[PDB]
């Protein structure tokens, strides 16, 4: 219900790549989807621009904390995905790029 613009519950890894790389999206475009690798957790997919490869999509595991919370690196955890998204929109803080706009469809 009423997903955030960045939340694509059931979108696969490959369809996330497909849509992020399509027209209307650009560097920093991103989404969060259920993980296809770790049942019960989420994956972050973000478009980046590499000197060598050109446009690419990179994926990060979002780890769950027992009894609530999320992280990408243990160095910093969050009580929710809103806080995680805000943090990595404000600073890359180790990611390949800052989160910019949710995937446009």
């Amino acid at each position: 219900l009423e997903p955030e613009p960045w939340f694509f519950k059931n979108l696969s890894r490959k369809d996330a790549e497909r849509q992020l790389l399509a027209p209307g999206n650009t560097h920093g475009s991103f989404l969060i989807r259920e993980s296809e690798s770790t049942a019960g957790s989420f994956s972050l997919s973000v478009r980046d621009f590499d000197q060598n490869q050109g446009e690419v999509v990179k994926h990060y595991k979002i780890r769950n904390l027992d009894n609530g919370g999320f992280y990408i690196s243990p160095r910093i955890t969050f009580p929710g995905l809103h806080e995680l998204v805000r943090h990595y929109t404000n600073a890359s803080d180790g990611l390949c790029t800052r989160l910019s706009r949710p995937c446009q469809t």
């Binding site: 595991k61 690196s73 160095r75 180790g94």
Partner: peptide, 4 residues
């Protein structure tokens, strides 16, 4: 997957 990428890592930080």
């Amino acid at each position: 997957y990428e890592e930080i």
